[model samples]
Target: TTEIHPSCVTRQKVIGAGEFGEVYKGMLKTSSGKKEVPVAIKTLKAGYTEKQRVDFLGEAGIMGQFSHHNIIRLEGVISKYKPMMIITEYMENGALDKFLREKDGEFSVLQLVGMLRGIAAGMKYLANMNYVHRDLAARNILVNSNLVCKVSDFGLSRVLEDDPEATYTTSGGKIPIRWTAPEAISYRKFTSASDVWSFGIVMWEVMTYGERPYWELSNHEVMKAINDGFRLPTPMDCPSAIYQLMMQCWQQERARRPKFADIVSILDKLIRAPDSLKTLADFDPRVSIRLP
Candidate 1:
């Protein structure tokens, strides 16, 4: 085991907590001691079982392999048999959901559109790398000072393979049902299509500045409504094409969802055409909303 010096490390404070661990803000000094780097240390909570330890470590390993501007970077892990710690890049702006909600209506439509496109671009990169972010949601997205989105929390992700039928069941029934697709909810199967569905919900969350998903309905009611063919209300200012894309993602048939590549392409065009992108003002009925 490498001995770390007291001067080289400083625990700032606790940032967040999970079922089996708590994340702390920490700083690490470089070898030359000239540079101090910010890092998040996820330490296993006491009483975490061996199985949980293995699972957490596995997730850390998976996240370590991913390298993209939109994805949070994993630095390293400190394993001491018990109370293992996984260090990662620290995002000062915190969770995307809370960040947007705090911002209220300050973000313009173009800014929100750019944020969603950044998330889609990240997902596109992950899909191309054969990784499925099964838990894509607003809470998992991190934002920076510039409103750039970075996908985080890969604890529920998995490597994809060519399987006609593959399924996984997580304990505690922790699935985000509101953001989940029909197939994942009913069959416990998560595919790229299902991920796309979750991404669409995230887009909606961004467009609405982190409005709660299905806030008007109970969990059971939301599930029943979805199973009964009910759809979510599209935001008033949401672009028609974007709204249609989200609906396509939630289709009952998994194969009907658009590919990540297609999503990236659509978002790219929309981002490029700044003037063509519709704002909330464009959809106001009294203002004679018009599309370019």
Candidate 2:
């Protein structure tokens, strides 16, 4: 891992806010200060305690080990002094959620399928590393100018535990109810299977051009409905095969969900023959946010 001297990075502007502080779009230069590269600088909020700083750096350390095309690349970190920052390769298009929301209906089905494929491939990589990303969502996936998606945000990631259940239960941090698996919400158990459930929601977001998974449903309502076995209906224009995969990911029994590699292979088939997505999944009118 490269320890970038604090002076090597020049923070430009706040791109987004994180739990700890603001993330900046910045410029970074090499040790010789010859070549420059645009990078995302994640800073720790001022007046943070030692524990906060440790947690912040902990995420950077985990990010440093990843070496996958579909995973966000860590440039370096400035943890030598105050204003600690984690530097990563900047994604021009930014988060997939807002990117697709802005260009809704502008992309072809093939393009959307390719984006989901990229995310599944990334998840497959993480699964192979025995890393369970407790928080996996469209908002956490970064997109580049070419529309390629790379999984980011290791803040909620944990290496698989060697227990009977192989689960990591969160003692803190609120889980995203709509995207979280039912078992994860109830028992706080997290595993690759839970991540797959979140991936299913990501697929729905992409297919619907970034529509919220459960529109207008309160977290309380969402959890109860999910417990009652109400999976998200197929998004308009979503392929039948893709929706079926989404359903498979939402299986109440975590063991029943498809593995990340299986998801990647399924997406691979869809990409190999775009003709396969010709049949759209049926959408039910009754599934709407209860109409008066």
Candidate 3:
């Protein structure tokens, strides 16, 4: 029988639910019973198949290899029972998407930029490690009180080395078309370049404070438009330089996308520029307009 820690029975509280599983906030006690650490527990849904088990374990394995401020820490895993579970460091602010939307898109553009920089830093680390975060979106980003962003949700991520040309066809025959790069949409190949495209969309999500991308179009229409070369719209208040980077990321050709390393360097310079203010209020009135 699997041992249920006392903390699990008393401190666990359901915080969110998703297709794969539900997440709970809990506290774990150290062996010495002197330390109580907060954690997020993700329990796999019952009746999951063998393939799902492999995918779950794979995510845990990948997360175990990474250690960075911008990435969530994996504490441990429990798989002895039928329904496996993963434990990770808890974030106070929850999902970036929900948080921003609740804030009414009030964050200054500079604050949004800093969040993007943190995401880029994490992506750069993953790129250096030869892994691609197949799913990159605002919902996958978690924040803290200080506005530090941590990339989470590795269910769809895969090791590129293990599958040199990471390609998986879905029965539904569609992906998150709005965030997908052209190559992944047409050729079914996902590379570091594709991840850059997704990152750009994620940046847009941050700048817009969690507004849905291509909100005017339905998912099918968006996919059709993307297939026909349509791109994301430029936000009215978005900076020209940032808009330029977003467009560059969506270039039809995979090789044309910016490298994560270059993205890190560019964002670093932008973050450090003396005139680069940290709040949306500091943005030029001409560039950033209040949304109705």
Candidate 4:
């Protein structure tokens, strides 16, 4: 039961276009005075049919269920007009991909591991809840003022299954081949293991400070290479231990891949050990400068 009031919002700054709607930075009035809280707003740009409107707001309905620090806090939904809006906690730094790219090489291995831990914790929570984030990636993760990572734009299995990408019909699902697991690509199968495989790619993204996985390999090329047992190489200066973990996540047999629980355990150990990343800590932002 989310409510959208036009009067409640002001000072809209359009940020970017979402897969379903336009995104904005705005202020939401909470107090009885002129004071307003800064927040992020996503609105439907196109015409909204009856069922489409219901499904749109319905997506925002389940936010309260996933109340976790690593999960985006869904504020509410505005459903009274042509452009329906979905408002959530305003993340100042924006998507993790862009943030890492902007501050490339500025983060140490410890910081990156911290980010990974947050994401894995969120994933584990979703797994226990029978949720599968078919669209988990750095772009879907948000960064806050505290530098905490929160997973977003995920777990709408029914919605994605209902409306798929054009290449989805041919690619099986709208998954990026680089982040997808083989069985998922081949048989359209999806499970936590497949999600684990994607997490490995995200690890590479963080290490490379937003490097594209597998370089310029096309979808078919990526598919063949992965099936041919090609996991991406370590990012320049990436720690051997972290790279080893990535390989573990990419095992051909999905069950053999580490579970989100294992990932959390491993990262926790790395975080606990101060000496674990002496060399990895001095990660150069210089190398990240040359990266795309």
**Highest TM-score scorer:** 2
Best of the two (3, 4) by TM-score: 4
Error of 1 at 79 (Å): 1.7
Model 4: how far residue 41 lies from native, Å: 0.8
Summarize candidate 3's per-residue lDDT along 206-281 as a digit string, tens digits. Answer: 8777888988786668768877888777665676667777778888778888998888888888778825542222
Q: Which rank order by TM-score, best down to worst?
A: 2, 4, 1, 3
Q: Per-prediction TM-score, please?
A: 0.84, 0.89, 0.82, 0.87
What Cα-based lDDT does every candidate model obtain?
A: 0.76, 0.85, 0.75, 0.79
**Runs of candidate 1 exceeding 4 Å displacement:** 1-7, 80-82, 156-173, 279-292
**Number of the predicted model whose lDDT against the real structure is largest:** 2
Off by over 4 Å in 4: 18-20, 33-35, 80-82, 155-166, 169-172, 279-292
lDDT of 1 by residue, 1-292 (tens): 2323445556689998756667888997758957889987777777877667667787787787888988887777777544677777788888998998899888777788888888988898898888778778888888876778898866553222111112233433346678888777777787788899999889888878889888778667877998899876777678777777777778888888888898988888977987766643234343565799
Name the weakest run of 10 consecutive residues (lDDT summed) in model 1. 158-167
Candidate 1: Cα lDDT at 89: 74
TM match of model 2 to true structure: 0.89
What digit string (tens of lDDT, one per residue) describes model 4 on residues 240-269?
678889889999998799999999999888
Model 2, runs deviating above 4 Å: 18-20, 31-34, 156-173, 286-292
lDDT string for model 2 (76-128, tens) is: 88877778888999999998989999998999999999999999999999988
Task: Enumerate residue pairs that collide in model 1.
Answer: none
Model 4 TM-score?
0.87
CA lDDT, candidate 2, residue 169 = 34
Compared with the true structure, the alpha-carbon lDDT of candidate 3 equals: 0.75
